[PDB]
Design an enzyme around this catalytic site. Structure first.
Site, PDB file in Angstrom:
ATOM      1  N   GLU A 235       1.010  -1.144  -0.059  1.00  0.00           N
ATOM      2  CA  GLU A 235      -0.120  -0.117  -0.086  1.00  0.00           C
ATOM      3  C   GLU A 235       0.945   1.375   0.123  1.00  0.00           C
ATOM      4  OE1 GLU A 235      -3.034  -0.681   2.964  1.00  0.00           O
ATOM      5  OE2 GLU A 235      -4.107  -2.141   1.729  1.00  0.00           O
ATOM      6  N   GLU A 340      -4.010  -9.137  -1.041  1.00  0.00           N
ATOM      7  CA  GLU A 340      -4.635  -8.705   0.364  1.00  0.00           C
ATOM      8  C   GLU A 340      -6.287  -8.711   0.157  1.00  0.00           C
ATOM      9  OE1 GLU A 340      -2.331  -6.058   2.707  1.00  0.00           O
ATOM     10  OE2 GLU A 340      -4.422  -5.596   4.247  1.00  0.00           O
ATOM     11  N   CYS A 342      -9.722  -8.743   2.757  1.00  0.00           N
ATOM     12  CA  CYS A 342     -10.078  -8.362   4.192  1.00  0.00           C
ATOM     13  C   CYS A 342     -11.468  -8.237   4.337  1.00  0.00           C
ATOM     14  CB  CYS A 342      -9.134  -7.150   4.465  1.00  0.00           C
ATOM     15  SG  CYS A 342      -9.091  -6.796   6.341  1.00  0.00           S
ATOM     16  N   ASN A 369     -12.922 -11.487  -9.322  1.00  0.00           N
ATOM     17  CA  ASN A 369     -11.618 -11.461  -9.627  1.00  0.00           C
ATOM     18  C   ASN A 369     -11.486 -12.363 -10.768  1.00  0.00           C
ATOM     19  OD1 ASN A 369      -9.708 -10.557  -6.838  1.00  0.00           O
ATOM     20  ND2 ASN A 369     -11.277  -9.423  -7.647  1.00  0.00           N
TER      21      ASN A 369
END
Ligand SMILES: *[C@@H]1O[C@H](CO)[C@@H](O[C@@H]2O[C@H](CO)[C@@H](O)[C@H](O)[C@H]2NC(C)=O)[C@H](O)[C@H]1NC(C)=O
Ligand SMILES: *[C@@H]1O[C@H](CO)[C@@H](O[C@@H]2O[C@H](CO)[C@@H](O)[C@H](O)[C@H]2NC(C)=O)[C@H](O)[C@H]1NC(C)=O
Ligand SMILES: *[C@@H]1O[C@H](CO)[C@@H](O)[C@H](O)[C@H]1NC(C)=O
Lengths: 496, 490
Positions: A235, A340, A342, A369
């Protein structure tokens, strides 16, 4: 094979309870003759990857939704599925007695569990750490003579990674990502907040930071671990925000481009670790396609970038077509990878034991995705405690396995089974293929072909209503089935 | 004119301190003489809407950034700017002594303040309330015989709205939005959580809810207040979410389409309040353009919808706002709600001010005709709020000190609201090179020009503005500044 021992904690579905002597597991994989399918089913009502078989028949009795396999329409090949060996995950796993540790690791990494083949490894501390270290906290050590791995690596993460790789029959790919540099390399002299590398690409600070990647790869290689890939920064956009609460390092897309072109790419290329791939971005997909345009339109950067890593949690701000789809269109030879995922809505607990909704968010994410060119997934923490920790910021979130150290027990959340409906049945090298819907519908579905040519289809029903369903394989015939309300199904069959 | 009394609370910039006898204000508006420009500057370093005047030059040379006005490239006409008279805002304002109340209202609504001409009015309770009432809480009162305004309307909101309109010289437009219906009109029988109207559009639940809108308008009209517009529902997507923590009422786009077509549109059209406009959505712009397509492709719904209301979340305009304008160019877009790890209230945050002006500029560059802040005033905790959903506000009231603090956000807003009257038209403004500045240009009804420039970087940016009718404005955009430029064109 041992079935799920269910437990309710008052949310929409059950967890599966595991302890030192008992964990749900599968028999070794076993596939039937041409004309037979296998179906694994999980439901909110409590079924957990339960196996049935049935016929693929020449006659089509269904009058509802038809999904037709189109094996000649070929898309991306899959790299794989896994999760993150954070300090927090390692501390949680190692607080269980050794036999419970082994059942938790088998759940993820054995063929009798869900067949993970990717582990993401933070380079030194992040929020899911109990303290704030780097590998080179001694200042003005530009040659990194004092670079070293602490206990978090040498006692917790490395030993667990060895054990995961021993349990896995599939080759496991390791992915490394740093959150912060040593603070003496940063404009703000802090592990967190708004801060970038001092100076400019090519200078002693940038060369030292690139050298830190090599020292990291060297140290893990001394412990007989090799990496598939590293990301350029976790990030990078976080370190451009005033007050950013935990470990970060700010890069504009331009600074990432120049860091990769001038320092990280050349340094990795001149090392013994030149085969390790480099992924860019490792950040929210709303930054695409802009970030990909800035880095990849510069040949001196683009020659060192293998792929683009994306994070899920700000997915609702930017649709997949405009981000993942447009990025693929502009850079079709640069793979997209979800590094990642979450979950954990400001009015809910960090951990909701048995949340079906949080499970459906994972499977819905994975299907979207896969429909937009993504080749792999790493979940975040492999395990947390019932508070969603430990985390030094108290940035508590959910995890597919929740460990209760005080009872030598771990709970497998619906998220674990939603992930497993993909990870168990989609080995590395599987290829997404066409799957045509005959009419508008409420299901989420995806088809892939194994390297051996066998079919896999995942069907998610996020609705309360049972949906009658036929699946057609032009080579085999018609699979007549039902997608129950609040269910997920994985279908597998031989095609010849 | 009285200048800012600055006070630091230890963050990036200062608040301006007001009390019963002192508040910063402007002299009555003036216009710069033809051949000159007016500049208003606010800085992180502490300048607050400070006025200077410079010459418009006939010539310009150099490689520096040039912004050129395209007065013939015409876009949207502006409705206005303002904020929300919540229960929380009214309670905080009316806890000050009367003279401090008057200086607070003047700050927002006077020509000597920042010239607000919008007020958003919740229809009964929201999270910025101290309890959860509706206007019709008697169960199964389908005839609404027990519809009534409580003290939150008659003692707090309505008197402050009358005082605001008395202070404003500009006509003020009132905008009304409901969070929840009566619980007996809802599938879940609760003000909050996942729940939509019972039954189906056209039925007695949907007709009762539409006649609740007319009863609200009737009751406000008994108090001599008229509304410009109502929204179909505040954040209809919220009531589709399980555990939604405060007042909500779920609608899918199809449910909104059908409720508007069958019930709300006809009911309002058959009432004495038929001139009141209806805005749809009143929710996050990420729901566009899909929500607009669902409602507005049905002519039975479209004929009742004047506009699309959007919410900001400040903490991709082209694909949402831009695409919606393209599909539905005669249906105005209006920003009806905006707010900002960190603490709810950050007294003197320049960053939160820059989020406001960046938002307004992005919005104006993508067809939005107006921008409505949330709570006009909160306490230093960011409340009161019955669910502790505390947030920041441009004015913070300290009841114990009979004091209020004007935050940087107040001045970032005022750089637009004070200088962009209703009817202003956005026009083109082209950069000569790539640059970190945010800028927008408009023309006043009378033909005069306004340009706002925001610098979110630490670096001073020399720049020139070219208007072919008059010449060149040579200026500087200091780092962490916002400027409003004004000039006559003839
Ligand atoms: C670990 O979990 C297993 C399964 O829940 C527990 O095994 C059960 O033990 C009970 C009573 O002690 C037996 O009567 C059941 O038949 C067992 N089930 C099975 C399949 O063995 C075991 O008790 C747990 N361990 C601890 C320490 O609680
Ligand atoms: C209201 O605020 C004003 C402005 O800060 C206060 O007036 C100032 O008081 C200080 C300290 O007594 C004087 O030195 C200044 O000259 C005053 N300025 C002006 C313009 O009067 C006033 O005291 C405040 N009222 C209360 C009750 O605190
Ligand atoms: C409802 O209205 C009736 C008749 O006007 C009145 O007597 C009663 O008090 C009302 N109920 C409530 C709860 O206000």
């Amino acid at each position: 094979a041992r079935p799920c021992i269910p437990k309710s904690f008052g949310y929409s579905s059950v967890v599966c309870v595991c302890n030192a002597t008992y964990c749900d597991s599968f028999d070794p994989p076993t596939f039937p003759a041409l004309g037979t399918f296998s179906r694994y089913e999980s439901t909110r009502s409590g079924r957990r990857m339960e196996l049935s078989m049935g016929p693929i028949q020449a006659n089509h009795t269904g009058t509802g939704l038809l999904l037709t396999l189109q094996p000649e329409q070929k898309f991306q090949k899959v790299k794989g599925f896994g999760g993150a060996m954070t300090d927090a995950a390692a501390l949680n796993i190692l607080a269980l007695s050794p036999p419970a540790q082994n059942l938790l690791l088998k759940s993820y990494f054995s063929e009798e569990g869900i067949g993970y083949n990717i582990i993401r490894v933070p380079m030194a501390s992040c929020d899911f750490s109990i303290r704030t270290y780097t590998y080179a906290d001694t200042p003005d050590d530009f040659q990194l003579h004092n670079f070293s791995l602490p206990e978090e690596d040498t006692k917790l993460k490395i030993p667990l990674i060895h054990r995961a790789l021993q349990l896995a029959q599939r080759p496991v790919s390791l992915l490394a990502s740093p959150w912060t540099s040593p603070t003496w390399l940063k404009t703000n002299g802090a592990v967190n907040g708004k801060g970038s590398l001092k100076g400019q690409p090519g200078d002693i600070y940038h060369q030292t930071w690139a050298r830190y990647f090599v020292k990291f790869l060297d140290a893990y290689a001394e412990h007989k671990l090799q990496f598939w890939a590293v990301t350029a920064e976790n990030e990078p956009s976080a370190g451009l925000l005033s007050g950013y609460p935990f470990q970060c390092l700010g890069f504009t897309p331009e600074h990432q481009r120049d860091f990769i072109a001038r320092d990280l790419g050349p340094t990795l290329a001149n090392s013994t670790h030149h085969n390790v791939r480099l992924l860019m971005l490792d950040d929210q997909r709303l930054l695409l396609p802009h970030w990909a345009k800035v880095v990849l339109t510069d040949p001196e950067a683009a020659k060192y970038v293998h792929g683009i890593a994306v994070h899920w949690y700000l997915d609702f701000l930017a649709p997949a077509k405009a981000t993942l789809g447009e990025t693929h269109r502009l850079f079709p030879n640069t793979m997209l990878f979800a590094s990642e995922a979450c979950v954990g809505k400001f009015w809910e607990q960090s951990v909701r034991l048995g949340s079906w909704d949080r499970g459906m968010q994972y499977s819905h994410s994975i299907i979207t995705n896969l429909l937009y060119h993504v080749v792999g997934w790493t979940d975040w923490n492999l395990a947390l405690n019932p508070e969603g920790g430990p985390n030094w910021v108290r940035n508590f979130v959910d995890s597919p396995i929740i460990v209760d150290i005080t009872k030598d027990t771990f709970y497998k959340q619906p998220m674990f089974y939603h992930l497993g409906h993909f990870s168990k049945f989609i080995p590395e090298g599987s290829q997404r293929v066409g799957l045509v819907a005959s009419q508008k519908n409420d299901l989420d579905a995806v088809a892939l072909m194994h390297p051996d040519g066998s079919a896999v289809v995942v069907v998610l029903n996020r609705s309360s209503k049972d949906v009658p369903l036929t699946i057609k394989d032009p080579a085999v015939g018609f699979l007549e089935t039902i997608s129950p309300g609040y269910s997920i199904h994985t279908y597998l069959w031989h095609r010849q």
